[PDB]
Design a protein around this ligand. Structure first.
Ligand SMILES: CC(C)(C)c1c/c(=N\C(=O)Nc2ccc(Cl)cc2)n(-c2ccccc2)[nH]1
Length: 351
């Protein structure tokens, strides 16, 4: 019942995987793990396999490993990453130190797509429809992505899209500093730590992404946090008293009040020649007050997606128990929890 495993060294890390996975080649790495492409001989799919790096080295890491496996097991949606397989070479809990996560290899990310091919309005409609369809599902489980950006959106050759989170980097202060894509899609309340954030932080990200699909250019390519804020406030206007009250960070509030007040721009004069319905949706997504942003479910009913919208085929998630998030456990308790989840994994059917 347990498959046979074989070992190999790729870019100075050991991969020990079931025999079903062949032709492993490295695709990326970071602080939390490494990814390889492979051929799954069982299903006949090209796959991507993330090996987590020392998943139980700290409490923070062990809880993260549990969190990821729990999230990935729950996800059952066409526009979101699905777990094809999870495995470990360990034969018991006592020797359980390694976690490997398998999903479909899609072919490209959305950075590839915006860089290398011109998109018509129909392409923008279809790609953004799918992001929002997946986001509806994600948000219905009270899950916030928080790092929606083109490199976390995988796209096949028929422009079918999946939301994922490679999750290889730490998102430290340094990784978020300077002229960097890691910060250009973040809602300003997350970027500047204004307040406790909502799931519409992800709608801001969709707005930034949609703008970029329409123009071919980054919406807010700030050279740093403050420059990026300035670019944002030039477009959407400076906040009024109502939003200022909601900024619970007194330090952040003090700084924004130092800026000269600016009105919202005419978005038809920014997104020159775009579908007026695209421009209308953008204005509803790129609202500074996150209480007043359009939701994913609201946005799916917008006239821009009239050719794709089907309210009978935009499903929500099964209930997701996140009570673990408020729980303090030891490493070995997170480990055993994670081990139970690996052991109980049942793969999806191959249609
Ligand atoms: C889209 C959603 C929000 C459900 C999410 C997905 C996710 N993980 C992944 O996408 N995992 C992944 C990505 C690529 C590969 Cl090859 C294998 C696994 N999250 C993740 C990543 C790291 C830590 C915790 C959660 N969060």
């Amino acid at each position: 019942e347990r498959p046979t495993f074989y070992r190999q060294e790729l870019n100075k890390t050991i991969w020990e995987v079931p025999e079903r996975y062949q032709n492993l080649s490295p695709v990326g790495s970071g602080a939390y793990g490494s990814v390889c492409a492979a051929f799954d001989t069982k299903t006949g799919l090209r796959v991507a396999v993330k090996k987590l790096s020392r998943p139980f080295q700290s409490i923070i890491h062990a809880k993260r490993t549990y969190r990821e496996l729990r999230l990935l097991k729950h996800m059952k949606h066409e526009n979101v990453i699905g777990l094809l397989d999870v495995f470990t070479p360990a034969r018991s809990l006592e020797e359980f130190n390694d976690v490997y996560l398998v999903t479909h290899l899609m072919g490209a990310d959305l950075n590839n797509i915006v860089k290398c091919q011109k998109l018509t309005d129909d392409h923008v409609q279809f790609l953004i429809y799918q992001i929002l369809r997946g986001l509806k599902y994600i948000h219905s489980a009270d899950i916030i992505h928080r790092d929606l950006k083109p490199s976390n959106l995988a796209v096949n050759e028929d422009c079918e899209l999946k939301i994922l989170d490679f999750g290889l980097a730490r998102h430290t202060d340094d990784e978020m500093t300077g002229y960097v894509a890691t910060r250009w899609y973040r809602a300003p309340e997350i970027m500047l730590n204004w307040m406790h954030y909502n799931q519409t932080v992800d709608i801001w990200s969709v707005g930034c992404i949609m703008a970029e699909l329409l123009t071919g250019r980054t919406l807010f390519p700030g050279t740093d946090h403050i420059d990026q804020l300035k670019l944002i406030l030039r477009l959407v206007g400076t906040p009024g008293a109502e939003l200022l009250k909601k900024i619970s960070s007194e330090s952040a509030r003090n700084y924004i009040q130092s800026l000269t007040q600016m009105p919202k721009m005419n978005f038809a004069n920014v997104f020159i020649g775009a579908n007026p319905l695209a421009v209308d949706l953008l204005e509803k997504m790129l609202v500074l007050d996150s209480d007043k942003r359009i939701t994913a479910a609201q946005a799916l009913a917008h006239a821009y997606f009239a050719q794709y919208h089907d309210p009978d085929d935009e499903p929500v998630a099964d209930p997701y128990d996140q009570s673990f998030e408020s729980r303090d456990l030891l490493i070995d308790e997170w480990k055993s929890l994670t081990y139970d989840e690996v052991i109980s994994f049942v793969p999806p059917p191959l249609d």
